[PDB]
């Protein structure tokens, strides 16, 4: 079963996640732009801007992406 959806403002940016590059079952958006994310076999997550650094949830991956971006707009993949 997919993780739950989420919607919050994190560090001034809107991050959204929902159940739905790979056939991969969950979508995340930063200010409306989709961020590629992926789930690992042990249930951890990564995103294309933190791809070598597993975190426990898709919200954690979205937050890690906002941290990485330092205010920059995400470009669509």
């Amino acid at each position: 079963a997919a993780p739950e959806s989420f919607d919050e403002v994190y560090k001034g940016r809107r991050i959204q996640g929902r159940p739905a590059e790979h056939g991969g079952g969950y979508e995340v958006f930063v200010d409306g732009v989709q961020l590629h994310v992926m789930r690992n076999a042990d249930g951890s997550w990564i995103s294309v801007v933190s791809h070598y650094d597993p975190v426990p949830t898709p919200r954690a991956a979205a937050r890690a992406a906002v941290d990485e971006l330092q205010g920059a707009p995400l470009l669509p993949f």
Binding site: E21, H22, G23, G24, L35, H36, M38, R39, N40, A41, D42, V48, V49, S50, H51, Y52, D53, P54, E68, L69, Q70, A72, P73, L74, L75, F77
Partner: protein
């Protein structure tokens, strides 16, 4: 073709390597390596097709990818070969690797921008074009997101693992390949990506020239593992869905198999590689 530890390059060899890298960038060829890597990063999944990452072919795939890149460098300057970064030995920001005559240093704390060396954005010679993070300058934060590079003792524990890889042949596997890649265990290759930070922490990690030196040392560790376990070899060896078996061909090239890449000495040697 001899691949040398970066720490050992002469000033002339660093000059020639940097110039060849910058020319691949200027001509447009470099960025397609970045693009190829990101496409595989994004499509390799633990429960579906997986070729470049999180799979047994992680090591031959990167071996062929680095050969393609080294052949492109040699098309510019036939004397140049890919050096390797032994991050277990050269483990601080003070390593000559990160000096302004080679790769330049860490990024400044505000925006992570690299401010010195040949690849600093201010030179006009290193636009970041293939990107997800919209910024167009090289970034790094050495030791920012993880405190330490792997040590020789940690590498040795991974080198001692006898099985090349194991079912289910993905990021959950026991075995040498997944320990070296770093998804399980004390974590070698993934941790180095995180330690450099900036683009090296992302799916467009070849945007940083250190990518190649990191993977050339990962590649060297496969060669070391082989010398430690001459009795052990690539697996799987046939009939595995979604995974590249030993004699199956690999995308994107389609014309080469893990079998064709196990013996690096068909293509290059190392400055030093311990015997069995």
């Amino acid at each position: 073709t001899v691949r040398k530890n970066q720490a050992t390059l002469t000033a002339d060899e660093k000059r020639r390597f940097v110039a060849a890298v910058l020319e691949l960038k200027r001509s447009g060829r470099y960025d397609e390596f970045v693009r190829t890597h990101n496409e595989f990063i994004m499509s390799d999944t633990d429960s579906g097709e997986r070729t470049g990452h999180r799979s047994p072919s992680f090591l031959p795939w990167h071996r062929r990818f680095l050969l393609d890149f080294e052949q492109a460098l040699q098309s510019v300057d036939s004397s140049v070969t890919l050096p390797y970064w032994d991050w277990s030995a050269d483990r601080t920001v003070r390593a000559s690797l990160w000096a302004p005559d080679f790769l330049g240093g860490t990024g400044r704390s505000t925006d992570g921008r690299v401010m010195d060396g040949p690849f600093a954005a201010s030179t006009g010679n290193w636009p970041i074009n293939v990107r997800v993070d919209s910024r167009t300058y090289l970034r790094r934060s050495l030791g920012g997101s993880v405190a330490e590079l792997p040590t020789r003792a940690e590498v040795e524990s991974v080198l001692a693992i006898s099985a090349y890889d194991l079912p289910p042949y993905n990021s959950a596997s026991e075995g040498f390949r997944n320990h070296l890649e770093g998804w399980r265990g004390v974590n070698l290759h993934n941790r180095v990506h995180v330690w450099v930070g900036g683009q090296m922490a992302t799916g467009v990690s070849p945007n940083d020239p250190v990518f190649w030196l990191h993977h050339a040392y990962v590649d060297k560790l496969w060669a070391e593992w082989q010398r430690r376990h001459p009795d052990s070899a690539y697996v799987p060896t046939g009939g595995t869905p979604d995974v590249v078996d030993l004699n199956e061909t690999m995308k994107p090239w389609n014309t080469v198999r893990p079998a064709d890449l196990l013996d690096h000495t068909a293509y290059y040697t190392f400055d030093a590689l311990e015997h069995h």
